[PDB]
């Protein structure tokens, strides 16, 4: 995209991203633009201080994507970048970008500026300690969209994309938004939401109508990465793969016949990037039968209750609900439908053991904490709500009894 032209793209893309709340990406735009000139000035040999364009691969791997004007321009661009991060609630990466700034001030020896350069790095980490893990910061809700239609869409005639919508834009917003944006450019009626979630491709669409698959997705990681991605920021910084659990239940949809499919898709360039959209490329699916998901989804509501107790706040409203979901089931199956189908003596003879054994330890830990939960709900009930909690432990104590009959085993 030549040196002279690929630069002008980033600038007006920054002020444009700046203009309409695409902060993080406009921020990313400047530190990604500033690497581009780092190599061009390396390519004329004008001189990690002054090491081509990989010194900005520290903050993001897609900084490489810019390689295929003077010094104070290189520092005016990071200076403009760092502030864009300061508004984009991403206080962290500002440390990894003031390095080459310092690496030149230490070369020209200024001290006062290096002083208040090292101050604003402290003025960031401090604001982090009251932001990080307070769930105050939020970007979130990346979506998985795909266009399908030949003789309709030009450049994006089919590719599968991944939008980063902002704040708490739910699907009611983005779906109505894409529908509306494209319904009135090819006539009403003929603009099908095509809510599918399944890896559609058969194109049994009667090509007189145009489709637009949409399906929420979540930054997906493994077991070893989950120790690394502890807080709320670290999971949004540089994400390869997002996963969405898609039900493929036998026949239609909705204990023993209900199954779901995790389909992960990567994103080529890593979020956050310059342009808001970026494509998927592959949807590898790990299918989970009605016992593997039972193990994993009944395990899901276990760690969650345990996560409202280590919290310091613990809000009287947010607890009583999730335990009603745990102890006092109404207008839903119930946590015991898992026991009778995959744990009764007559059942659980063809399902392998150790599977059912892990289902035991999850079941107990889900109990011993469930009881820890009702005690906390006794600490902030106050007044009338006490007559209620008297019923909660009742439903819970009975839940222990039935668990003991299906399992042929004593439950304390």
């Amino acid at each position: 995209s030549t040196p002279e032209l690929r630069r002008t793209w980033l600038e007006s893309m920054a002020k444009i991203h700046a203009r309409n709340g695409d902060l993080s990406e406009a921020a990313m735009c400047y530190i990604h633009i500033a690497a581009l000139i780092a190599e061009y000035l390396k390519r004329k040999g004008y001189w990690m201080f002054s090491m081509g364009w990989p010194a900005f691969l520290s903050i993001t791997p897609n900084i490489k994507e810019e390689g295929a004007y003077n010094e104070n321009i290189l520092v005016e661009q990071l200076y403009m970048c760092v502030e864009f991060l300061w508004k984009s609630e991403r206080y962290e990466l500002i440390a990894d970008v003031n390095k080459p700034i310092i690496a030149v001030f230490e070369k020209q020896r200024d001290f006062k500026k290096l002083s208040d350069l090292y101050y604003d790095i402290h003025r960031s980490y401090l604001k982090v300690a009251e932001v990080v893990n307070s769930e105050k910061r939020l970007f979130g809700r990346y979506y998985r969209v795909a266009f399908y239609g030949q003789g309709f869409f030009e450049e994006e005639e089919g590719k599968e994309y991944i939008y980063k919508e902002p704040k708490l834009t739910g699907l009611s917003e983005i779906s109505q938004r894409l529908l509306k944006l494209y319904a009135d450019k090819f006539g009403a009626d003929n603009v099908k939401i095509i809510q599918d979630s399944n890896k559609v491709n058969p194109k049994d669409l009667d090509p007189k109508y145009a489709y637009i698959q949409v399906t929420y997705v979540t930054p997906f990681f493994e077991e070893k990465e989950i120790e690394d991605r502890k807080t709320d920021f670290e999971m949004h910084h540089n994400i390869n793969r997002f996963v969405f659990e898609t039900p493929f239940t036998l026949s239609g949809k909705k204990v023993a016949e209900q199954c779901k499919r995790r389909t992960i898709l990567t994103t080529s360039h890593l979020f956050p990037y310059v342009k808001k959209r970026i494509q998927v490329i592959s949807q590898s699916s790990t299918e989970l039968n009605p016992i593997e998901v039972a193990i994993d989804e009944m395990s899901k509501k276990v760690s969650e209750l345990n996560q409202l107790c280590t919290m310091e706040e613990v809000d009287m409203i947010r607890l009583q609900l999730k335990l009603q979901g745990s102890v006092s089931v109404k207008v839903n199956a119930g946590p015991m439908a898992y026991a009778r189908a995959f744990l009764e003596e007559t059942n659980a003879k063809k399902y392998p053991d150790n599977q059912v054994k892990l289902l035991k330890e999850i079941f107990r830990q889900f109990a011993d904490a469930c009881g820890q939960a009702l005690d906390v709900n006794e600490r902030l009930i106050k007044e009338d709500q006490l007559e209620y909690q008297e019923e909660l432990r009742s439903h819970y104590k009975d839940m222990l009894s039935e668990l003991s009959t299906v399992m042929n085993e004593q439950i304390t």
Binding site: T169, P247, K253
Partner: protein
């Protein structure tokens, strides 16, 4: 920090709706689970908020074991589908008399679900066999105003229309009464 009840006749899509909202996945495609009583956080007006949802049964045999959780709630709402007005007849009489009996002065917006079907011909064809179907927003606004409520909202299960606004005005009832 907000508590919020979901009343209504059984199979007024109460669970069918809330399942589809708190997990963004489009209705009928909701990845199903037990537990019940859902919740999630939503961006409204300017601020973000955590919105809590208590599920209630319209299955008759769970009366007396229902009202005990109404304690602590900060906004109420009653769910009837515009599909079967047998729910609409039964909500003036079963659920407003139930709200006067527990927390009788906390706003309870009554909402219409399953609007999508009010233009479906194959259901108006089963509706014409018994000769009943429409539940009009003129009557809807009026039943809710005479039920002393704050708002009636024609919402839809699928097609997403009508939705979002409901949970928004649920908390917008709390902020600006």
């Amino acid at each position: 920090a907000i508590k919020c009840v979901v009343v209504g006749d059984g199979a007024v899509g109460k669970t069918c709706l809330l399942i589809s909202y708190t997990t963004n996945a489009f209705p009928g495609e909701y990845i199903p689970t037990v537990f019940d009583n859902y919740s999630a956080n939503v961006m409204v007006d300017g601020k973000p908020v955590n919105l809590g949802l208590w599920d209630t049964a319209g299955q008759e045999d769970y009366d007396r074991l229902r009202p005990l959780s109404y304690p602590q709630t900060d906004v109420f709402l009653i769910c009837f589908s515009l599909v079967s007005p047998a729910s609409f007849e039964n909500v003036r009489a079963k659920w407003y008399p139930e709200v006067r009996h527990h927390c009788p002065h906390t706003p309870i917006l009554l909402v219409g679900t399953k609007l999508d079907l009010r233009d479906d011909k194959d259901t108006i064809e089963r509706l014409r066999d018994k000769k009943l179907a429409p539940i009009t927003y003129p009557q809807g606004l009026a039943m809710a105003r005479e039920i002393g409520s704050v708002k009636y909202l024609e919402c839809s299960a699928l097609t997403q229309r009508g939705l979002k606004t409901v949970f928004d005005e649920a908390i917008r009832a709390v902020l600006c009464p």
